[PDB]
């Protein structure tokens, strides 16, 4: 319950600069 | 324990903990983690992918699978090999494609016979089943996903079996594949943790159709 947020947050971080 | 052989010839056993998974129609898969040892050395340093694994469940269940993923980690002065594997009655389907675009009306036996051309495996339907028409063939597609589409149209489920014979795999196509089982369950005796989930977010009472 506590855990989903950290992974999704890092995921949204990774959405910055993933694409040429 | 687990007899693995190259795609050409002789076998070699290894002991290793296995994790198998089997669904009704979906692809089965297994996974396991060999480690370097005084034993197993000749194998582990010499596995290439599409090594052919078999003799799971001992001297029975000779359901021959094939490895496709290969991890190799370094632990201490030794090395691990995690790895994955898939059925030959499914991979052997993922081998071959069909380029002739199937199109038009199609009876079930014709369809599931043109797709078993050169594979050697065998199919059969149990009950009478209707026929429909397939709009575009998968010229650039596997035999597997056309098998998927065929099951979606005509044979809503299936079940494979390694018949007694060598290099044969009977596909009993059937709607709602089932066999009776003498065993059973209960919370007290065999069911530790029963998670009953009742999902209804896309559900229906009446419905229209055209």
């Amino acid at each position: 319950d506590a855990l989903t947020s950290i992974v999704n947050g890092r995921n949204a971080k990774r959405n910055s600069e993933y694409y040429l | 324990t687990i007899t693995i052989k190259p795609p050409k010839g002789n076998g070699a056993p290894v002991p290793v903990e296995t994790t198998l998974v089997k669904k009704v129609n979906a692809d089965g898969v297994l996974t396991f983690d060999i480690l370097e040892n005084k034993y197993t050395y000749e194998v582990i340093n010499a596995i290439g992918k599409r090594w052919i694994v078999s003799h799971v469940e001992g001297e029975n269940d000779k359901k021959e699978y094939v490895i496709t993923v290969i991890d190799r980690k370094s632990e201490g002065d030794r090395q691990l090999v995690e790895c994955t594997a898939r059925e030959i009655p499914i991979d052997k389907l993922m081998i071959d494609r069909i380029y002739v675009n199937v199109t038009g009306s199609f009876t079930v036996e014709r369809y599931f016979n043109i797709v078993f051309q050169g594979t050697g495996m065998l199919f059969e339907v149990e009950g009478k089943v209707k026929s429909s028409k397939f709009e575009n063939g998968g010229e650039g597609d596997t035999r597997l996903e056309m098998f998927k589409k065929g099951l979606e149209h005509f044979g809503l489920e299936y079940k494979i079996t390694y018949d007694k014979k060598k290099d044969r795999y009977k596909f009993v196509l059937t709607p709602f594949a089932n066999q009776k089982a003498s065993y059973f369950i209960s919370d007290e005796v065999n069911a530790n943790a029963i998670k009953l989930e009742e999902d209804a977010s896309d559900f229906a009472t009446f419905i229209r159709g055209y």
Partner: protein, 314 residues
């Protein structure tokens, strides 16, 4: 009280190196259980239970003639013992708490002193210590501290630990039991009859469909890591070859054709058809000797069977 160590390439004993020991204490094997608790049932299922590790402890101290030398001696200890290299430990005991014997104070029959400043109670040849048992242990070291009590006396607390299998590997095969060539390596802990060539010593049979074996080891030799090794001259040609065994599973060799005079080396989970080029696809099943009578049953009267193995203890 010497704590012998046979390493890969050498033999060492501490008291040779000025290293007395206080004692040796050998724990039993840490039984790791695998239970599963049913949710609302007053009882939990045994998934498994299994031996793991036999942690040894040995506190050893040392005296020297001068305070400096302590350092050297200590370093020797480390360089001599702390070896990740799996070693073979052998325990030693004494047969008696020896005392100084009567003498005569007439400017004669004076007392002796060891290389270390101690009184030699070991007057005769038959005084010094003995390999208390004909077994060893595959062993590795764990961390030590060295408190220096006064003077030149310093203590150490070795904490050894089993390496591969938590068992008392018996040194020497079962064929040295057969051929009474090697001497030593057979202690009375193993209840062994003197009738060499008689039953319960022999592991070399001829021209038999079925025969009897006495595995003197309390612990069972089901684990492959143990040096269970069979070799059989098959006696009679065949296309298939089954042999059964009690306290173990059935074994087949089907699908490969053999001949009479051809021999099989049946190593643990492994089959040399003719000594090389292992043909081990047929019924991967390994045999298991538990203790005492392990009766085997072949099917076509092999002209020879003989098998060496190692006895393991718990």
């Amino acid at each position: 009280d010497i704590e012998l160590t046979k390493k890969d390439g050498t033999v060492i004993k501490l008291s040779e190196y000025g290293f007395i020991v206080n004692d040796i204490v050998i724990d039993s094997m840490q039984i790791n259980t695998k239970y599963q608790d049913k949710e609302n049932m007053n009882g939990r299922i045994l998934m498994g239970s299994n031996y793991i590790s036999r942690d040894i402890v040995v506190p050893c101290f040392c005296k020297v003639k001068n305070r400096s030398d302590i350092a050297y001696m200590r370093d020797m200890l480390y360089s001599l013992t702390t070896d990740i290299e799996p070693m073979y430990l052998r325990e030693i005991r004494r047969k008696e708490e020896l005392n100084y014997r009567f003498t005569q104070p007439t400017s004669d029959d004076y007392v002796k002193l060891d290389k270390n400043n101690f009184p030699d109670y070991e007057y005769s040849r038959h005084d010094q210590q003995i390999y208390v048992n004909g077994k060893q242990y595959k062993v590795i070291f764990n961390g030590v501290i060295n408190p220096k009590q006064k003077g030149n006396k310093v203590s150490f607390e070795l904490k050894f630990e089993t390496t591969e299998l938590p068992y008392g590997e018996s040194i020497g095969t079962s064929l040295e039991l057969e051929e009474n060539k090697k001497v030593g390596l057979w202690s009375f802990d193993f209840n062994i009859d003197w009738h060499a060539g008689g039953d319960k010593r022999k592991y070399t049979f001829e021209n038999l469909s079925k025969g009897t074996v006495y595995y003197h080891g309390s612990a069972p030799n089901d684990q492959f890591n143990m040096y269970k090794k069979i070799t059989i001259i098959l006696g009679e040609d065949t296309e298939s070859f089954v042999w059964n065994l009690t306290h173990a599973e059935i074994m087949k060799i089907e699908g490969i054709k053999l001949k009479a005079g051809d021999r099989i080396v049946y190593d643990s989970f492994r089959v040399y058809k003719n000594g090389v080029e292992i043909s081990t696809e047929t019924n991967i099943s390994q045999p298991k000797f538990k203790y005492g009578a392990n009766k085997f049953e072949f099917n076509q009267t092999v002209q020879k069977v003989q098998f060496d193995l190692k006895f393991y203890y718990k």
